[PDB]
């Protein structure tokens, strides 16, 4: 019942979901980077909360992505 | 106590984790695409297990990735809102 054509469409949907995650990481890292020279005084206090949020999100999501990539790697490796 | 420098290192590790996932889906999709020309003449039953497994893997992770991307978007949006206030 499953055809490679169906799997192709699904793979594109995955590429898009992963790409959207990449986009938001890049956006967040850009925001963080924009503060590099400015982390002092009122700026520190202003963005402290966002920094706490960012650490907690990124640190927790790294291993989820690693599990995903490892799973796909194994599937691709064994794909006959 | 969190600094932009600490966050940058974490962010790079996260970019890499996401990039690696993109790399592996590209590998798998290349494998899938390469099967299309021979599909009509294949013993298709021999592919069923790996097709079911790969379909499950790809589909199941989509809402998880969407949850992650939405979560990050919300933080980036707050950044924008805070900065604009």
Tab-separated table of C-alpha atoms in Angstrom:
chain	number	residue	atom	x	y	z
A	1	UNK	CA	0.000	0.000	0.000
A	2	UNK	CA	2.816	2.431	0.847
A	3	UNK	CA	4.647	3.608	-2.283
A	4	UNK	CA	7.963	5.462	-2.522
A	5	UNK	CA	5.947	8.404	-3.876
A	6	UNK	CA	3.977	8.570	-0.614
A	7	UNK	CA	7.215	8.349	1.367
A	8	UNK	CA	8.649	11.210	-0.726
A	9	UNK	CA	5.732	13.496	0.151
A	10	UNK	CA	6.076	12.609	3.826
A	11	UNK	CA	9.839	13.216	3.683
A	12	UNK	CA	9.209	16.703	2.294
A	13	UNK	CA	6.834	17.407	5.176
A	14	UNK	CA	9.590	16.347	7.575
A	15	UNK	CA	12.177	18.532	5.797
A	16	UNK	CA	9.775	21.436	6.196
A	17	UNK	CA	9.126	20.788	9.881
A	18	UNK	CA	12.887	20.475	10.547
A	19	UNK	CA	13.589	23.564	8.444
A	20	UNK	CA	11.064	25.595	10.433
A	21	UNK	CA	12.897	24.563	13.606
A	22	UNK	CA	16.196	25.607	12.001
A	23	UNK	CA	14.630	28.955	11.096
A	24	UNK	CA	13.523	29.705	14.646
A	25	UNK	CA	16.871	28.690	16.125
A	26	UNK	CA	18.560	31.056	13.673
A	27	UNK	CA	16.149	33.834	14.597
A	28	UNK	CA	16.727	33.305	18.324
A	29	UNK	CA	20.501	33.094	17.919
A	30	UNK	CA	20.406	36.330	15.915
A	31	UNK	CA	18.516	38.009	18.747
A	32	UNK	CA	21.065	36.719	21.252
A	33	UNK	CA	23.966	37.777	19.051
A	34	UNK	CA	22.578	41.303	18.699
A	35	UNK	CA	23.091	41.698	22.452
A	36	UNK	CA	26.764	40.564	22.460
A	37	UNK	CA	28.291	44.030	22.842
A	38	UNK	CA	25.453	45.331	24.987
A	39	UNK	CA	25.038	42.982	27.942
A	40	UNK	CA	25.219	45.551	30.725
A	41	UNK	CA	23.000	47.937	32.640
A	42	UNK	CA	19.327	48.172	31.760
A	43	UNK	CA	19.754	45.830	28.782
A	44	UNK	CA	20.742	42.946	31.084
A	45	UNK	CA	17.684	43.439	33.268
A	46	UNK	CA	15.390	43.898	30.280
A	47	UNK	CA	16.290	40.629	28.579
A	48	UNK	CA	17.174	38.424	31.568
A	49	UNK	CA	13.872	36.552	31.370
A	50	UNK	CA	14.285	35.783	27.683
A	51	UNK	CA	17.786	34.473	28.363
A	52	UNK	CA	16.458	32.117	31.056
A	53	UNK	CA	13.750	30.939	28.659
A	54	UNK	CA	16.248	30.476	25.828
A	55	UNK	CA	18.662	28.388	27.901
A	56	UNK	CA	15.892	26.119	29.173
A	57	UNK	CA	14.394	25.604	25.699
A	58	UNK	CA	17.588	25.097	23.717
A	59	UNK	CA	19.298	22.836	26.252
A	60	UNK	CA	16.232	20.600	26.432
A	61	UNK	CA	15.649	20.437	22.680
A	62	UNK	CA	19.214	19.531	21.659
A	63	UNK	CA	18.891	15.883	22.812
A	64	UNK	CA	15.461	15.553	21.199
A	65	UNK	CA	16.923	16.547	17.829
A	66	UNK	CA	19.878	14.237	18.400
A	67	UNK	CA	17.507	11.326	19.026
A	68	UNK	CA	15.649	12.163	15.819
A	69	UNK	CA	18.788	12.355	13.703
A	70	UNK	CA	20.172	9.124	15.175
A	71	UNK	CA	16.912	7.305	14.428
A	72	UNK	CA	16.834	8.524	10.822
A	73	UNK	CA	20.527	7.735	10.372
A	74	UNK	CA	19.956	4.123	11.403
A	75	UNK	CA	16.921	3.821	9.155
A	76	UNK	CA	18.815	5.301	6.192
A	77	UNK	CA	21.859	3.095	6.921
A	78	UNK	CA	19.747	-0.070	6.781
A	79	UNK	CA	17.495	1.097	3.957
A	80	UNK	CA	17.704	-1.601	1.314
B	1	UNK	CA	24.136	34.852	35.398
B	2	UNK	CA	23.363	33.653	31.873
B	3	UNK	CA	25.399	35.622	29.317
B	4	UNK	CA	25.069	36.032	25.547
B	5	UNK	CA	28.297	34.019	25.204
B	6	UNK	CA	26.925	30.969	27.047
B	7	UNK	CA	23.743	31.150	25.029
B	8	UNK	CA	25.729	31.411	21.783
B	9	UNK	CA	27.541	28.158	22.509
B	10	UNK	CA	24.272	26.399	23.331
B	11	UNK	CA	22.638	27.868	20.217
B	12	UNK	CA	25.440	26.580	17.987
B	13	UNK	CA	25.034	23.101	19.444
B	14	UNK	CA	21.309	23.365	18.743
B	15	UNK	CA	21.870	24.559	15.156
B	16	UNK	CA	24.119	21.537	14.706
B	17	UNK	CA	21.581	19.109	16.169
B	18	UNK	CA	18.904	20.458	13.828
B	19	UNK	CA	21.264	20.496	10.842
B	20	UNK	CA	22.149	16.849	11.463
B	21	UNK	CA	18.455	15.933	11.432
B	22	UNK	CA	18.076	17.778	8.115
B	23	UNK	CA	21.098	15.877	6.782
B	24	UNK	CA	19.637	12.494	7.721
B	25	UNK	CA	16.202	13.182	6.230
B	26	UNK	CA	17.983	14.212	3.033
B	27	UNK	CA	19.857	10.896	3.031
B	28	UNK	CA	16.671	8.929	3.599
B	29	UNK	CA	14.713	10.918	1.010
B	30	UNK	CA	17.466	10.317	-1.545
B	31	UNK	CA	17.147	6.578	-0.893
B	32	UNK	CA	13.369	6.782	-1.307
B	33	UNK	CA	13.600	8.779	-4.539
B	34	UNK	CA	16.106	6.310	-5.982
B	35	UNK	CA	13.561	3.486	-5.612
B	36	UNK	CA	10.902	5.085	-7.778
B	37	UNK	CA	12.196	4.035	-11.188
B	38	UNK	CA	12.458	0.361	-10.263
B	39	UNK	CA	9.309	0.201	-8.115
B	40	UNK	CA	6.917	-1.419	-10.597
B	41	UNK	CA	9.311	-4.329	-11.137
B	42	UNK	CA	10.387	-4.793	-7.526
B	43	UNK	CA	9.306	-7.554	-5.168
B	44	UNK	CA	7.446	-4.902	-3.249
B	45	UNK	CA	6.715	-7.158	-0.268
B	46	UNK	CA	10.423	-7.090	0.635
B	47	UNK	CA	10.169	-3.322	1.182
B	48	UNK	CA	7.019	-3.291	3.293
B	49	UNK	CA	8.660	-3.420	6.724
B	50	UNK	CA	11.170	-0.675	6.018
B	51	UNK	CA	8.476	1.456	4.370
B	52	UNK	CA	6.195	1.148	7.408
B	53	UNK	CA	9.073	1.922	9.786
B	54	UNK	CA	10.271	4.941	7.807
B	55	UNK	CA	6.741	6.309	7.343
B	56	UNK	CA	6.218	6.037	11.112
B	57	UNK	CA	9.542	7.708	11.945
B	58	UNK	CA	8.989	10.646	9.612
B	59	UNK	CA	5.328	11.210	10.469
B	60	UNK	CA	5.660	10.857	14.214
B	61	UNK	CA	8.371	13.492	14.505
B	62	UNK	CA	6.549	16.191	12.539
B	63	UNK	CA	4.318	17.352	15.445
B	64	UNK	CA	7.286	17.154	17.813
B	65	UNK	CA	9.360	19.402	15.538
B	66	UNK	CA	6.355	21.725	15.192
B	67	UNK	CA	6.089	21.918	18.991
B	68	UNK	CA	9.777	22.807	19.178
B	69	UNK	CA	9.546	25.425	16.428
B	70	UNK	CA	6.449	27.015	17.985
B	71	UNK	CA	8.121	27.037	21.415
B	72	UNK	CA	11.150	28.840	19.973
B	73	UNK	CA	8.998	31.251	17.980
B	74	UNK	CA	7.240	32.297	21.179
B	75	UNK	CA	10.557	33.178	22.819
B	76	UNK	CA	11.767	35.071	19.746
B	77	UNK	CA	8.424	36.920	19.618
B	78	UNK	CA	8.757	37.921	23.290
B	79	UNK	CA	12.235	39.164	22.429
B	80	UNK	CA	10.751	41.392	19.735
B	81	UNK	CA	7.933	42.617	21.993
B	82	UNK	CA	10.293	43.353	24.887
B	83	UNK	CA	12.719	45.162	22.607
B	84	UNK	CA	9.908	47.255	21.090
B	85	UNK	CA	8.390	48.304	24.428
